[PDB]
Design a protein around this ligand. Structure first.
Ligand SMILES: Nc1ncnc2[nH]cnc12
Lengths: 112, 381
């Protein structure tokens, strides 16, 4: 029992899925850089300066993600739209696992 | 680019609006983001200066170097009761520079201080640019509005804000006067008209009483609340859903800034829906601690939650009718300004007070001021 009306809500969630991927790419670069500074051969004095330099980027990534969640939160999905509700829950959980990795970046930079 | 027409600008506390008179009607200009009103925000970063939407958008990332509410500081001395009262709620610094307040930000790695009119000018340039982008013409001439209670210092500083911005400020008119001009209450029959302007918007509440004697507007009285707006109605809706989540799951989400943010955001949307529908639904997956929050609110409930706040808007109406020395029955017209006047309970309480009298709400409330200032700009053109 699949409705054409659901296809509309599925397209919304797919476009939001691709937007998550774009912000996930930015998170991926930050994490490679962070891992690189932490494990890297950089002079210890410099390391702090190199870490804090990730602050503006990490904070932008977190905001972009929060905006994604607020676009998801405007969706009203009826019971019968089972696939859209599972797709909805999955994406929010993925953006949340992404946001918790961002918090980890923030916990590893600009510390004193 | 060819020379353009003159514009009307409403320089508000939270949002500014720009309109142009063309083809025998006022057109309110939408910005680069397609928004008909632009945030009164200026954000300073390591690499650039952001104005309007782009400044409002990064606030959460950069709260200390994002300035808003300059209008509250404009033309005021540092030692003003209003200045010292407000800076306690701002995430940005305000410093005393020879008795004059100045915002203190971190711009391109340097400590930069700006006078309130320099901030307000950057916002005005944005308004000027918004019009230049739409018309494909260079905009210089403008009519900028100020509240009726603005003193000489506050008024001159606003004209100084218009000057620095590079605008040939044709005139500075009152916000109540502009909203009255928008409805053409000055072109009406009879000799004397007593106008009541109910302005619930831009984080402020202003009740103005005006008298149109031969097309001359006189301000009989001013009343209201400088810290009453849309946000207060939202706060009540936020407290309701926190308590509900508490009775539903025995978990407090107030400590989590992100869960409160998500709930408050849907609460702003649910309120707007409650102005045209008698019910609003909310579905927030994994709100707090992995729990999904699927709920609803009726118009009746939203009204109950703000009942004291809503009824309380008439105290200023009664206070203004007192100071103007007029009975309510002596009021020829009622004008609705600001987005919160879209609230059906506010319309009903104000309609019942004026014994079922029709309200002037046809012109978008958010645009009524700019609409009036644009009519004025065309006349002086
Ligand atoms: N539609 C609306 N209803 C209630 N408050 C509002 N504020 C702005 N627009 C609004």
């Amino acid at each position: 029992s699949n409705s054409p009306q659901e296809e509309v809500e599925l397209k919304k969630l797919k476009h939001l899925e691709k937007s998550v991927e774009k912000i996930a790419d930015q998170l991926e670069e930050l994490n490679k850089e962070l891992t690189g500074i932490q494990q890297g051969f950089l002079p210890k004095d410099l390391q702090a300066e190199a870490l804090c330099k990730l602050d503006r980027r990490v904070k932008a990534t977190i905001e972009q993600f929060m905006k994604i969640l607020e676009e998801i939160d405007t969706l009203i999905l009826p019971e019968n739209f089972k696939d859209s509700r599972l797709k909805r829950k999955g994406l929010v959980k993925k953006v949340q696992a992404f946001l918790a990795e961002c918090d980890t970046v923030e916990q590893n930079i600009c510390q004193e | 680019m060819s020379k353009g027409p003159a514009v009307g600008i409403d320089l508000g506390t939270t949002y500014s609006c720009v309109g142009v008179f063309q083809h025998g009607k006022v057109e309110i200009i939408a910005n680069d983001q397609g928004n008909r009103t632009t945030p009164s925000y200026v954000a300073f970063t390591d690499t650039e200066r952001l104005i309007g939407d782009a400044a409002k958008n990064q606030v959460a990332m950069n709260p200390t170097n994002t300035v808003f509410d300059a209008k509250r500081l404009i033309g005021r001395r540092f030692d003003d009761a209003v200045v010292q009262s407000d800076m306690k709620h701002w995430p940005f610094m305000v410093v005393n520079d020879a008795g004059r307040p100045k915002v203190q930000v971190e711009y391109k790695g340097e400590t930069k201080s700006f006078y309130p009119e320099e901030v307000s000018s950057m916002v005005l340039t944005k308004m000027k640019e918004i019009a230049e982008a739409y018309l494909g013409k260079t905009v210089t001439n403008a009519v900028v509005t100020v509240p009726a209670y603005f003193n000489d210092s506050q008024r001159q500083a606003t004209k100084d804000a218009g000057t620095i911005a590079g605008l040939n400020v044709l005139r500075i008119i009152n916000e109540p006067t502009a909203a009255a001009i928008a409805y053409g209450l000055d072109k009406k029959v009879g000799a004397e008209r007593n106008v009541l302007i109910f302005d619930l918007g831009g984080g402020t509440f202003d009740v103005s009483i005006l008298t149109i004697e031969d097309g001359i507007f006189e301000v009989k009285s001013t009343a209201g609340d400088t810290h009453l707006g849309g946000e207060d109605f939202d706060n009540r809706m936020v407290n309701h859903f926190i308590a509900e989540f508490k009775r539903k799951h025995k978990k407090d989400i107030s400590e989590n800034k992100r869960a409160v943010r998500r709930l408050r955001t849907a609460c702003e949307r649910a309120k707007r829906t409650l102005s045209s529908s008698t019910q609003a639904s909310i579905e927030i997956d994994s709100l707090y601690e992995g729990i999904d929050f699927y709920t609803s609110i009726t118009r009746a409930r939203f009204e109950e939650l703000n009942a004291d706040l809503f009824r309380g808007t008439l105290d200023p109406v009664e206070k203004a009718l007192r100071d103007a020395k007029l009975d309510k029955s002596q009021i020829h017209d009622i004008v609705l300004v600001g987005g919160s006047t879209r609230i059906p309970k506010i319309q009903k309480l104000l309609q019942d007070f004026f014994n079922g009298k029709e309200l002037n709400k046809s012109i978008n409330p958010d645009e009524a001021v700019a609409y009036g200032a644009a009519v004025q700009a065309a006349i002086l053109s």
